[PDB]
Amino acid sequence: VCLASLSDPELRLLLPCLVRMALCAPADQSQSWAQDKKLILRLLSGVEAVNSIVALLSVDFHALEQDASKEQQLRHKLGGGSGESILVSQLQHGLTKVSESNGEFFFKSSELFESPVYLEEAADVLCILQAELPSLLPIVDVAEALLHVRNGAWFLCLLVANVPDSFNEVCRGLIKNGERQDEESLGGRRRTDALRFLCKMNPSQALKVRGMVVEECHLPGLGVALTLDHTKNEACEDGVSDLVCFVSGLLLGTNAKVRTWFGTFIRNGQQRKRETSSSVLWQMRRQLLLELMGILPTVRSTRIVEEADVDMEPNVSVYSGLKEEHVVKASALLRLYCALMGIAGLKPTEEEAEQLLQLMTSRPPATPAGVRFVSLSFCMLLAFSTLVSTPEQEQLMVVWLSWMIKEEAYFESTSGVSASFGEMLLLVAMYFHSNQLSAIIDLVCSTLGMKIVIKPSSLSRMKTIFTQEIFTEQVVTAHAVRVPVTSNLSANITGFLPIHCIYQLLRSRSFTKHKVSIKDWIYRQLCETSTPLHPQLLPLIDVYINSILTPASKSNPEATNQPVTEQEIRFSITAQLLVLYYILSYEEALLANTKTLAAMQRKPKSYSSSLMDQIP
Amino acid sequence: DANSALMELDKGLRSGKLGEQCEAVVRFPRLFQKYPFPILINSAFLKLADVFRVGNNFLRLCVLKVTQQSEKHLEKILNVDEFVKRIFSVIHSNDPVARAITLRMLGSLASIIPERKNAHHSIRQSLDSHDNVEVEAAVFAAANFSAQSKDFAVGICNKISEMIQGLATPVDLKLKLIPILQHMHHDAILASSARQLLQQLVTSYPSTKMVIVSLHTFTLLAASSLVDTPKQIQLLLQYLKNDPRKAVKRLAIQDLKLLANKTPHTWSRENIQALCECALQTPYDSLKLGMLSVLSTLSGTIAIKHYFSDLVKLAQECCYHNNRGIAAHGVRVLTNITVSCQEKDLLALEQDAVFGLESLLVLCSQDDSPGAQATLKIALNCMVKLAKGRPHLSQSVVETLLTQLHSAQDAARILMCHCLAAIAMQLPVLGDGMLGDLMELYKVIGRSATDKQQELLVSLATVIFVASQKALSVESKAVIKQQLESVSNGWTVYRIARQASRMGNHDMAKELYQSLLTQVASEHFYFWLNSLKEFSHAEQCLTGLQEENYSSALSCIAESLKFYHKGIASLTAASTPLNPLSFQCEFVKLRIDLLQAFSQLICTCNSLKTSPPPAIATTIAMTLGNDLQRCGRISNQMKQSMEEFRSLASRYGDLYQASFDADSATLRNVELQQQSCLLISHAIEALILDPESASFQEYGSTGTAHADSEYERRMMSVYNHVLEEVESLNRKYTPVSYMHTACLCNAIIALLKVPLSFQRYFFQKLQSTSIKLALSPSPRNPAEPIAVQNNQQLALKVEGVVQHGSKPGLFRKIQSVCLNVSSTLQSKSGQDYKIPIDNMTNEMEQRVEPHNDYFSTQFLLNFAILGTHNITVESSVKDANGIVWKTGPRTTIFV
């Protein structure tokens, strides 16, 4: 509140030439300058020259009042100390009016009245800090706040007292002068900030008396402009995260730095990922503030993040989609939104959900980052179906889903990623076809590190009604069969390979009668990888063996041409072992059932003992 | 979860289903590897003994293979007698294959039952049986039981002697029975008898395989029983000088190599002279190569110091040989002799050394073959050793390296750059001299390269950053130009930026991090790169300080702290449960706290002039005060700074012992940071405050010639400057800190000269060791406390298993686990803490030494409080030298 931030920052380092740059600002902190220019020790020559220059530059109109205050403080060295000691002794013993007799004119004329007023204020502050919760008795020196603050600064600079107690008294009486205390010593700013941050609880600063303390801390951080990030970190690490969020928002609105990444998201990212203590702290804080609408910091944070989000909306409006330079920031913001609305999240609105649906349905530049962003947007729209209330949103989202299903092949061919979004789309389609919803939950909680719950098999059920509309077994099976095989697997990359959807398709049913004999895809997959042993290869081979002795779902028995062209001597060790396991499983299945309804299922096409003698 | 697996394996083993039984048996080792718990292993081994007692003779082989595979999990078996009985109950059958399988199983169990007389009697009886596979199994079991069990050795030595000398067994049976004599090192009489037997076998059975196996047995006995190693060396030299065969000569060469590898101090001058005389009379190349390899292995130990002129002549003659391996061995011997020995004339040999290195450079420059790359690496590490052990010839090798850098087809320049980077870590004048040539090579290398352009560019950038000190001239723009329009491999530029941040170059690091921020294929790596960029920017802005400046220094400190806060926020935004970042967060937070303490110190030093004398003088005369000299309000700020520095040093010492996986460089950097913090604390305690408190002069040597980095040398020089400026101004002026604050601020600025050095452990975290510490208390699945009578007792039964994701014996080895346990009251009794004493008397600091990867101790506690308590345990692993190494498992149980 006009605490001379620049003048204070200049005087904190050295007062050599900054005395001439501030003419009217040298009115509140003039007491410290007068005390340093009158009671100087004259240690060094440069220090003496600086003190002389400061005394020469302090020849203002209020120099007489400053000299009178300095003389009153010097004359109150022994008498005021004894008076305060006697008052403290009397208060300790007892614990075991015409504007207060012209209090405005008495404290400015005689030093004894000012000393008595300071002693009474200190006693009241001690009584309120011992055991009390109140902020009254502040309109005593409202008309003479300047003289009262000057007298308090003179008493603090002349008489020994506690800095934390004085800061607490200033925060409880009038914060407008609290920052003035920072202009008295200009050395205990960090200590005062830590004391103010440690003088509050966790569930406060929202609808209690801690709002005044939070405002005072914000004003002090704005007047300092140096330890603001340190104060925000201390708050986020100890208590009162709302003050830290407000300080971060103020620093982001004042300074134009952090252009590559918004500092608000940078600070809000560490709330549902680690540090479970601060995690549940922020959780209960946002839970308590969600119902309360008359609070400034959280709504300002939502507004700034919303405008930072919509600054990228004209780009996808006039162009096809996002750009390469803004494809990672959008994904980070989307993941932050997901983490914020993971469990016990806030209630969204339409003016934000519209832009969310517009950005989540953009056109990436066919970059693995863009593929990850598309997958994250798909999981976001699948875990939350709060978009069906309006027709235009649902029609645009289904149009974009059809576009993604069409261009999945292009996105997988250009971008050399292992698991694209099309694999997840086909997997959730097969899951909806198999009439279960727990697999969708496992999918959405396995694609990203958030063990959250959405609804007990009631939220995604609506999507099922859409699944039977257009995305029926006529196109999803084609897209699952027309996927390219993965080369040189690793069993370590995060994602769902086509092996999963192929296994799900072979397990559910294959009654299409026009999309059988997928042995070519199986061979092209098991051709040559040799690095891992995927845990799904054996169940895939098992369900493929079971997909031969099944009624009317007749596939090819993997004729001996592939074995004789593979096991002839890149057809590595793992491929040969998998082929041998498949052959042995087929030989075992030829003897297990032996009964295939005796209806046109009489062509097993077994081996004639001419291939088994060749394979070692 | 392991109970379900054991149950399903039992259900699979219940029915016959030979295939399913074999499947379960071969899957048992995976269950052993997954759960190393002793009770589950004991139950599984009991079930294996059960299925071994009755079987179709094929499950027995699978159980034998499982036992041979899982050998380390064999000592953690509770019921051993029943297991051994069930195993031995099948040796009385008439099936020879079953008896052979049982004998092999017993031999596989020779580490847990070395005194069972029934097994010894069975092996003794079945050793001379009328069979072919049972005899081999009995021989295997006899060797296993003769390794240990001295009684079995003394009982089987005579039988082995008669069976070998009976001349009624084939040559293969004797060749298999001879290696049994290796385990006769239990007594001197056994060693003498085995030596006489082997001598008689050599003198009576002259044959290639016979002599080879007998000499192998004899040398293994001599190496395991170091009583007659000189006689072994003499016999090997005699056989090298007399026996004309080629196989026996190579056997003796490998024998001498093994002896020098294990026991090199038993060699004498006569043995080395005889070996040199034998090598000088060898017309072949492979034999001379092996003898020179043995000589090079010997010269790397104290043998070359005890030998001190035939070895010198041999090394000088084989240094310029036609083949490359012999020349590499010769120059290695010469370099080892130069480094170890310090004779007078040997100085001239130094010449023959350096030029000899050229003989290994012009022959393996553009060969592109492993046989040449091996000798190249040998010569390069020998040159590194010669440069690090003798700085007198540091330039005479770097000039040859620079001249040879132009004679490689982009194949050996990576190794030359590695050698240059390893050599330049000691003396910076080499880098100052070769920076120009390195930049010339970096400019002329960006023409065309496809095979290994990535690693070549990485090595060039690394050696340039090591040679350079500022990287602010045109060279940085040239490197940026060479890396921009060329192939933009993300890993290459990432490694270049990592090396730049490691060496201290922060401008190039910031540029590369900004270039990489726009190309990230994920979200966590994006935050990681953003944090690295913010840290590099704060480091670069930290270097923007001027000597004797205090106006802009506060602004630079503030902006560096702001950038550090942004970076640590973006970094902790990337901390995930999967692969969590614990060292980086703590390191950055402690650096931020140290810089905040420095900012508070400079702020207090500046505010000392803001009328501090007359502030506290109103209550007491600070002038000529014997109680508190120059008593002012600055004393509280000085005490706060001192306690902050003490807490920072304590947290540094905690972080040192909390890693347990950091390299030597990272530990040295942490130690240097803590030393600087403690030095600033000592300066604020002894100089600014009363000098009569400590008055301890630092009259001791420091900064020895052992630092392996320029950062360490600069830190040590700054430490010495601070000590020499604080030891003199102690009793000069009054304690009002008139001139003391000036030198204090100068030292603070000097400490901020070197920005930082992100060591190797900051990235690529390897050697991931972890103690599971899975105690076995009463069954408590929920969070409800165990119902105890509160008066009898409460047992713990704690046990932990160590798990190493990487190579265990890489940097440190686990030797002891100092398990600690404490108790406290959960509910508040009278205050916010547990109680007046918190019931933390029950510590019971036990020191268990796990021989294998398993340990188990017993803990108790006595409490008479009807409330709820909390029990916590800590691992506190101890290494070989002995350090607390405070680990953070934090296993806390209520009751």
Swiss-Prot record, chain A:
Full protein: residues contained: 32 to 688 of 1204
Chain's role: Component of the integrator complex, a multiprotein complex that terminates RNA polymerase II (Pol II) transcription in the promoter-proximal region of genes.
Organism name: Homo sapiens (Human)
Keyword Transcription regulation belongs to the record: no
Keywords linked to the UniProt accession: Cytoplasm, Membrane, Nucleus, Transmembrane, Transmembrane helix
Family (UniProt): Belongs to the Integrator subunit 2 family.
The protein, known as: Integrator complex subunit 2
Primary site of residence: nucleus
Disulfide pairings: none
Compartments, record wording: Nucleus; Nucleus membrane; Cytoplasm
Gene Ontology terms: biological process: regulation of transcription elongation by RNA polymerase II; RNA polymerase II transcription initiation surveillance; snRNA 3'-end processing; snRNA processing
Subunit structure: Component of the Integrator complex, composed of core subunits INTS1, INTS2, INTS3, INTS4, INTS5, INTS6, INTS7, INTS8, INTS9/RC74, INTS10, INTS11/CPSF3L, INTS12, INTS13, INTS14 and INTS15. The core complex associates with protein phosphatase 2A subunits PPP2CA and PPP2R1A, to form the Integrator-PP2A (INTAC) complex.
Source organism, top-level taxon: Eukaryota
Swiss-Prot record, chain B:
Keywords, sorted A to Z: Chromosome, Cytoplasm, DNA damage, Nucleus, Phosphoprotein
InterPro entries: ARM-type_fold (IPR016024), INTS7 (IPR033060), INTS7_C (IPR054519), INTS7_HB (IPR056517), INTS7_N (IPR056516)
SUPFAM superfamilies: ARM repeat
Residue(s) carrying Phosphoserine: S776
Protein localization: Nucleus; Chromosome; Cytoplasm
A Pfam family the protein falls into: INTS7_C
Main location: nucleus
Record keyword Nuclease present: no
Highest taxon of the lineage: Eukaryota
Record's subunit section: Component of the Integrator complex, composed of core subunits INTS1, INTS2, INTS3, INTS4, INTS5, INTS6, INTS7, INTS8, INTS9/RC74, INTS10, INTS11/CPSF3L, INTS12, INTS13, INTS14 and INTS15. The core complex associates with protein phosphatase 2A subunits PPP2CA and PPP2R1A, to form the Integrator-PP2A (INTAC) complex. Interacts with NABP2.
PANTHER family: C1ORF73 PROTEIN, INTEGRATOR COMPLEX SUBUNIT 7
Function: Component of the integrator complex, a multiprotein complex that terminates RNA polymerase II (Pol II) transcription in the promoter-proximal region of genes.
Name used for this protein in its record: Integrator complex subunit 7
Organism name: Homo sapiens (Human)
